[PDB]
Amino acid sequence: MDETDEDEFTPRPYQVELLERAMKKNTIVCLGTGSGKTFIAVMLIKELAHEIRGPFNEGGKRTFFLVNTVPLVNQQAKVIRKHTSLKVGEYVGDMGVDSWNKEKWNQEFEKHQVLVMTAQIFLDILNHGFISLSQVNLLIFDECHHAVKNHPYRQIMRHYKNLEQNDRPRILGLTASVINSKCKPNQVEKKIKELEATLNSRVVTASDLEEVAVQKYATKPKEIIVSYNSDRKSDTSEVIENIINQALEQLSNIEETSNLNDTNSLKQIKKVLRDIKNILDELGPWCAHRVIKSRIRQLEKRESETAEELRTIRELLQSIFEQIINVLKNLEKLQKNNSVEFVSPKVKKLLEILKQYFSNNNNSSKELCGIIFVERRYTAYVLYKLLNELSAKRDDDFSFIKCDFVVGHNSSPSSKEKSTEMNSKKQKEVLKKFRKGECNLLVATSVVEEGIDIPKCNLVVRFDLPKNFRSYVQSKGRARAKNSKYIIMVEEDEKNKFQEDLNQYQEIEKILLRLCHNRDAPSEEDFDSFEDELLPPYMPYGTDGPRVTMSSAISLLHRYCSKLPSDRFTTLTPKFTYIEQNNEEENKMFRCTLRLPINSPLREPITGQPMPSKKLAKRSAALEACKKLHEMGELDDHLLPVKISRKNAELK
RNA sequence: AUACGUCCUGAUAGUUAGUAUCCAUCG
RNA sequence: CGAUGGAUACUAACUAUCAGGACGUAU
Numbered sequence: 001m002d003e004t005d006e007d008e009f010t011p012r013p014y015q016v017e018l019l020e021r022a023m024k025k026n027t028i029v030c031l032g033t034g035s036g037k038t039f040i041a042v043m044l045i046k047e048l049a050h051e052i053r054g055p056f057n058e059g060g061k062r063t064f065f066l067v068n069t070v071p072l073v074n075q076q077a078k079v080i081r082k083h084t085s086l087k088v089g090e091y092v093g094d095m096g097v098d099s100w101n102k103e104k105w106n107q108e109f110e111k112h113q114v115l116v117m118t119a120q121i122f123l124d125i126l127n128h129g130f131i132s133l134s135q136v137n138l139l140i141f142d143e144c145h146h147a148v149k150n151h152p153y154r155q156i157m158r159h160y161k162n163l164e165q166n167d168r169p170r171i172l173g174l175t176a177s178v179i180n181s182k183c184k185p186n187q188v189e190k191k192i193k194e195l196e197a198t199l200n201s202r203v204v205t206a207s208d209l210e211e212v213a214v215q216k217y218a219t220k221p222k223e224i225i226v227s228y229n230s231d232r233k234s235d236t237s238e239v240i241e242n243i244i245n246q247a248l249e250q251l252s253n254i255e256e257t258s259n260l261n262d263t264n265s266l267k268q269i270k271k272v273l274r275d276i277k278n279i280l281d282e283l284g285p286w287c288a289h290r291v292i293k294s295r296i297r298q299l300e301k302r303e304s305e306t307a308e309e310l311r312t313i314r315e316l317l318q319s320i321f322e323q324i325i326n327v328l329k330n331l332e333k334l335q336k337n338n339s340v341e342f343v344s345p346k347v348k349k350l351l352e353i354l355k356q357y358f359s360n361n362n363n364s365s366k367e368l369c370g371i372i373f374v375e376r377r378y379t380a381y382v383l384y385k386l387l388n389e390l391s392a393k394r395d396d397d398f399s400f401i402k403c404d405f406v407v408g409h410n411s412s413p414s415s416k417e418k419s420t421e422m423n424s425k426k427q428k429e430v431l432k433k434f435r436k437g438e439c440n441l442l443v444a445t446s447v448v449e450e451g452i453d454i455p456k457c458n459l460v461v462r463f464d465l466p467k468n469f470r471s472y473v474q475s476k477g478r479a480r481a482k483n484s485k486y487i488i489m490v491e492e493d494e495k496n497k498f499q500e501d502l503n504q505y506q507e508i509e510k511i512l513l514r515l516c517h518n519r520d521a522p523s524e525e526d527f528d529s530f531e532d533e534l535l536p537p538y539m540p541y542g543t544d545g546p547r548v549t550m551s552s553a554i555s556l557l558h559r560y561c562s563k564l565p566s567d568r569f570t571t572l573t574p575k576f577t578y579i580e581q582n583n584e585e586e587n588k589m590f591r592c593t594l595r596l597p598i599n600s601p602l603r604e605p606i607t608g609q610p611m612p613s614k615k616l617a618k619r620s621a622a623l624e625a626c627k628k629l630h631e632m633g634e635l636d637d638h639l640l641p642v643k644i645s646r647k648n649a650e651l652k
Numbered sequence: 653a654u655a656c657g658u659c660c661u662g663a664u665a666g667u668u669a670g671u672a673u674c675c676a677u678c679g
Numbered sequence: 680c681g682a683u684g685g686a687u688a689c690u691a692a693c694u695a696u697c698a699g700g701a702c703g704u705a706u
């Protein structure tokens with residue numbers, strides 16, 4: 001039954017116009033979400049493909065693609081591979097790319113024609129002298145509105161500025177919302193001018209888009225606001241939260257009265273029980289008890305190695321949680337087979353919304369595909385568990401629900417035994433399952449919120465309020481299919497503030513849509529204007545060799561310290577000490593000092609130059625330490641830590 | 653009625669310090 | 680799990696401007 005579906009792409013007229021304009025000179029493309037900018041980028045890549053066929057040893061060039069997150073790089077690589085005939089490769093941080101030497105990087109450059117990877121990796125390659133910007137043919141900045149202050153985009157731009165104008169590559173950027181944070185309507189012009197100066201380009205908007213052409217293809221859902229109140233609570237729930245409050249009070253009294261071997265341990269206990277209180281308030285007693293038994297398992301793990309006082313505190317906490325369990329036994333909704341009443345009013349409202357949506361779509365032949373957006377990861381995990389349990393209960397109207405979740409990921413040589421784990425392959429598998437149609441619901445954090453082409457959706461639910469203009473715009477634009485719905489859940493007493501914020505957002509959008517028409521080219525004087533480096537970098541082998549920028553000193557120092565062979569449990573870390581002195585002008589002056597662990601050969605402390613701010617003093621001290629360390633003979637030619645073992649140390 | 657200096661309040665812009673959360677790199 | 684970096688929101692202090700209130704001086 002499967003039929004192949006080639007795109008057989010026929011570009012739309014505004015795409016052709018934008019392609020010509022971008023070919024003429026540097027540009028930034030500003031268009032609404034879902035209007036098809038990735039195909040424009042693909043067309044531009046294909047147009048200039050006659051400069052890539054040459055070998056790399058004889059000065060051949062390559063094309064690069066810059067992306068923020070991992071699902072995005074996978075998806076864009078797949079699209080480019082499908083549409084054109086060139087070879088594409090994808091690089092991320094899972095594979096452990098820093099351990100590679102120069103020869104393997106040269107081989108990788110020789111193998112492919114187009115390279116797609118994250119921005120931080122590109123910065124690392126640029127700094128350590130593996131590649132030079134004179135060999136790049138074209139650069140693409142996905143979501144270019146992130147290049148502000150100290151973001152890695154700005155650092156790469158600083159690298160680009162020094163190069164002579166004879167051999168500078170072309171620049172193209174794609175964005176939908178031009179301003180990152182929230183601001184008054186009077187600062188929009190200043191913000192766009194700053195961005196134009198930073199990226200050394202002018203913004204462009206098609207004349208045909210304003211006339212029908214792109215309105216048909218752009219996505220616009222409907223907005224609905226649903227209100228709930230959390231004051232209305234069950235008396236038993238009030239009793240439980242009062243008991244938890246008095247437990248918090250007595251634990252605080254114990255902390256204030258009883259001395260502690262580690263105050264941070266009881267502070268952690270207090271914050272995790274406050275988290276338990278928050279979980280109860282937001283979700284309900286059953287989810288709280290599930291987290292409580294997970295906590296029970298956590299101290300089952302912990303009791304192998306713990307202190308006596310810490311274990312007594314843990315056991316009195318266990319006693320309190322056990323009393324909570326006996327209180328819940330009287331409220332055994334699952335035993336009573338009526339679990340609808342116990343949940344917090346917010347969860348009840350969400351369930352009512354889902355039921356109404358299913359009732360509406362019962363007549364509709366099309367299936368359902370929805371996304372739920374949550375702020376923190378633990379809430380997402382607990383919500384997924386609860387929804388799966390309700391579906392397994394097999395009641396009247398929850399027999400069709402299938403749920404899964406996606407969050408960020410971590411990796412370590414250690415086991416990291418925990419309830420929540422993630423990996424690149426598992427994340428890709430879940431996304432593929434969602435695309436195919438195995439699951440109908442997805443519970444996600446802000447990882448997938450931006451830029452992901454989602455399967456045709458009908459429903460987006462905001463479990464938490466948007467924080468600024470950009471997040472609101474992107475979350476609105478995530479739904480793609482026709483006749484979509486956008487739903488926001490708001491507490492009763494914050495609805496006026498949310499209303500005024502929505503009005504301000506609409507005004508900002510209206511102003512932005514008009515200001516971008518018929519703009520003027522930027523001036524190179526502003527490009528020469530921006531300069532935040534108070535101290536020049538450290539270049540031992542010349543301008544084109546390796547460098548250690550002021551911003552990257554501390555990370556390199558900590559990497560060297562971590563690579564030092566020592567005990568597994570002990571994680572060595574340099575110690576910092578700040579001394580403040582007042583100058584003749586009575587201005588604030590900061591001088592920092594540094595020390596190293598006794599394992600490293602460098603015994604003597606190192607002192608940096610005085611700086612107006614504490615962070616600047618710390619950076620200066622780190623830079624001086626790095627220069628001295630290289631002078632002594634630790635770091636190798638490429639200015640990265642040497643793979644030195646005990647035998648290597650003995651030989652040297 | 654106005655200007656100058658002083659004290660208090662609100663907003664705007666910038667700087668500094670603290671708390672919470674998210675995303676990337678490493679062990 | 681730990682370590683590092685970047686971004687957002689909240690609070691406090693300082694500086695400058697604006698707005699208002701009060702005081703003294705001069706016009």
Ligand SMILES: Nc1ncnc2c1ncn2[C@@H]1O[C@H](COP(=O)(O)OP(=O)(O)O)[C@@H](O)[C@H]1O
Pocket residue numbers: 009010011012032033034035036037038039453
């Ligand atoms: N020429 C075209 N013909 C058919 N579909 C297209 C064309 N150009 C773009 N599209 C569709 O429009 C959607 C645009 O999404 P995408 O380009 O990934 O991000 P953006 O929302 O920034 O444009 C894609 O899913 C693609 O399938």
Ligand SMILES: [Mg+2]
Pocket residue numbers: 037038142174451
């Ligand atoms: Mg895109």
